[PDB]
Every structure is written in C-alpha cells, then in structure tokens.
Amino acid sequence: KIEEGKLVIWINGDKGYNGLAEVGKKFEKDTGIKVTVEHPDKLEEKFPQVAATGDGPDIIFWAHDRFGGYAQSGLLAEITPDKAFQDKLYPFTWDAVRYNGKLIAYPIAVEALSLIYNKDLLPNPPKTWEEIPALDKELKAKGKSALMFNLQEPYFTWPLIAADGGYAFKYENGKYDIKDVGVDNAGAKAGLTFLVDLIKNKHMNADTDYSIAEAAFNKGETAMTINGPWAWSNIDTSKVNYGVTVLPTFKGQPSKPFVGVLSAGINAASPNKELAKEFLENYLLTDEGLEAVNKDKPLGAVALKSYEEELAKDPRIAATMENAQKGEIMPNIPQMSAFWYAVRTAVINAASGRQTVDAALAAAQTNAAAMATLEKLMKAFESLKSFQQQQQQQHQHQHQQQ
C-alpha cells in the first residue's frame, strides 16, 4: 500500500525538503495530484525494510552507493529516460545510477573532495603534490604547516593513491569486475609511497584525524586541507579567508577522489511510476526545480548541465565539479565493504611504518577476501535463522501438524 493517485517522497532531513515540497506544490497546480515530502529518521535503514513488503515511498532521495543494495534486492524500478533527456545531465553521472546494466535512479547532486587553501597564508596554491614538501619548509619557518588532512580514513587518502593508476574495481561494459582490483598495482604503490614519505620526513603526522585536521585549518595553523562541501559552513564561521580549488596533481596525473551522487530512485512497488517520471524529469530536473531546492538548502554541484553552469559562478562549486569529473565514481557493489576494511588497514600500517608500502598493499588483497568470508558467513547464518523461523511457524506447531 503506497496509495495510487498521489506521490510520496522520502528525502533526508539535512536537504532542502521544503524547497522540494514547493516543486510538489508546482506539480499539484498543473496535474491536480498531491505530493507529500517526508523526511523520516534513518530512512536509509527503513527503506529496505518497508519496500520489501510493498510499502515505503514512491520516490527516495539518497546517495547512489546505497542504491546498489536496493537494486540488488529488487526494490527500485528501471527508469526510462530517452536519449535527449540523458544529454541534459553530465554523462559521467549516469554511470553512478547503473545496476546490472540497467538505470535505477536519477542523478541530482554531485559530491567530491577538493583542496581548500588559506588565502591569507597561501595566495597561490600548489598545482602538484611534489612541490608541497618544499612548501612546508617555507611555512615551518613562520611556525605553520603546508598541509593537514585526515589520514585515518581511506576516503581522504585515496585521491593521492589513485592518482597514478589506482582503482577500487575496474568499471568496464557498465559493470564492475570484482576479479580486477587496483590496490597493489604500480600507481597505487607510488601514491602511498609518496604519502608515507611525507610522514617520515615530518611534513605530515600519521595520527592526524578529521577533528585535528579541521581544527588546525580553521584556527589558521595550516595553509591547506582536503575536505568536501560539508565542511565549508564551519570554515565560514571561523572567519578564515579561504578558497576551494582543484586537487594537486601527482606524477602529472590529477588526483582521483571518490564521487558521491545524490540520486532519486523510484520504488519498484510504486503504482505511480509514470507520475514519478513526469515529476522528476519535467519538474525537478529543471532549472526552476533545482533552484527551489538549492535556495532552501544548497545542493552543491548538480547533475543538470544548464543549472550547474549557473552555480559554477561560485568558484567553490566549480571546483567540486572539476575534481569530481577528474575523479572515480564510488562503486555501488557489496564488495565495497571488504575494500574499505582492507585499504583502511593498508594505509594505517604503511603510515605507522608497521609494514612497507609494498607489503601493506599486498596484504589488502588477502585481508579483503578474509572480510568477504565473514560477510559470506554472516549471510549464511541469518538465512538459517529465517529458514527455521519459516518452518517453525507453519509446519510443526504447538497446535498443528504436517
């Protein structure tokens, strides 16, 4: 039961839902069909539960990486935009909303890491990673540092690692090959070796986490930091004069940060598929549609070419998109769990000097496969719980038989 004759939308609380409701208000005045916008707690946890039974919203807004799991479960419907509508959004975004060859969601916003520099300390940010060590010595004389960013999470260190030919899984033929991992290749080796060399030459500290990195830049202690659009608001409050720009190149190659895409998916159980399509394609994914949402709570860089060109007058939003286009799209597959587990360990152990770069990255392959087994066990036993509960109910009972 989702109610035929109306649309119900689920979007997270930190987004411009009131602005989205104004698009749904515009939709009513034209079609006479009422659009409700709901923003429930942990909707990402709730959606798989309710949609499995045939309930939940008509449309759901979330990051694309979580949509891979929804489509695996058959909770999302295959969308049908034509060639001409597909030309409206940046071609690279459409690859993020693909599962099993077929398209499963509409890309809305684009999210990726950028290089954030202090304008007062550093008017000309470096274009290369290689010139940062020399730039640190020049700033250490003034009692400052060149660069401080989170080293604990692989998400932040990956841009450098992937610069030279490092990848999570090979994306070819619209499918991720899980037998083709680019974690201990030549380019990932050099990327991490540069990061470790930065640490043992005291240009960075191996223990630097998110808090330590943010607090440093916002006090004016460090000239540069690596962070996403979610951090801009806190830098605005610190009164620091900052700029957001393209990430530094390593061995002439651009940094490849992970790209997160906010996407709109249609519930497979929805009896209003065509209505949702009309809403999303012809009301929301238009200049006026995205503007209403952006004015409530900024979307950052958007998928729609026409509206992105208008936001890109903000040099920070242009930088987000530029880094995104040069970046790697976040894979939406289940194997991504084992990847994080292994690479998080790999970088920690190389940065501490516990393992060589060569041996820490080699260990990732065997460490991720090990984690896949725990997940493989996890699913097997929860299946048995269900099986026993299944029979326990019908077949032999305190008041039944077979």
Binding of residue 348 to a copy of itself (CB under 8 A): yes
Binding of residue 239 to a copy of itself (CB under 8 A): no
Contact partner, 186, from Zn ion, a copy of itself, none, Cβ < 5-8 Å per class: none
DSSP class of 399: T
- For residue 266, give the nearest of 24, 59, 6 by alpha carbon: 59
Binding of residue 389 to a copy of itself (CB under 8 A): no
- For residue 361, give the nearest of 374, 348, 375 by alpha carbon: 348
Q: Which of 6, 34, 39, 273 is in the footprint of Zn ion by CB under 5 A?
A: 39
- What track of x and - describes contact with Zn ion for positions 53 through 82 (by CB under 5 A)? -x----------x-----------------
Residues with Cβ within 8 Å of residue 105, at least 6 apart in sequence: 64, 67, 76, 79, 97, 263, 264, 265, 266
DSSP class of 177: E
Q: Which of 282, 306, 383, 392 is in the footprint of a copy of itself by CB under 8 A?
A: 383
Beta carbon nearer to Zn ion, 310 or 375: 310
Q: Which of 233, 386, 401, 402 is in the footprint of Zn ion by CB under 5 A?
A: 401
Helices 336-351, 154-161: crossing angle, 10 deg rounding: 80
- For residue 163, give the nearest of 141, 192, 139 by alpha carbon: 192
147-179 burial, b if ≥16 CB within 10 A, otherwise e?
A: bbbbbbbbbbbbbbbbbbbbbbbebeeeebeee
Q: Which of 80, 306, 390, 392 is in the footprint of a copy of itself by CB under 8 A?
A: 390
- For residue 115, give the nearest of 135, 96, 95, 97 by alpha carbon: 135
Helical H segments across 180-272, by residue range: 186-200, 210-219, 232-237
Please report where in the chains the tokens 């939003």 appear, as a residue.
317
- What track of x and - describes contact with a copy of itself for positions 37 through 66 (by CB under 8 A)? --------------xxxx------------
Please report where in the chains the tokens 């597959």 appear, as a residue.
333
Tell me how far, at minimum, the Cβ of 267 lies from a copy of itself, in Å. Answer: 10
Binding of residue 359 to a copy of itself (CB under 8 A): yes
- What track of x and - describes contact with a copy of itself for positions 166 through 205 (by CB under 8 A)? ------------------x--------------------x
Beta carbon nearer to Zn ion, 119 or 202: 202
Binding of residue 142 to a copy of itself (CB under 8 A): no
Residues of the shown chain interacting with a copy of itself in the complex, contacts defined by CB under 8 A: 51-54, 72-75, 143, 152, 184, 205-208, 212, 268-269, 341, 345, 348, 353-356, 358-359, 361-363, 366-367, 369-371, 373-374, 376-377, 379-384, 386-387, 390, 394, 397-398, 400-401
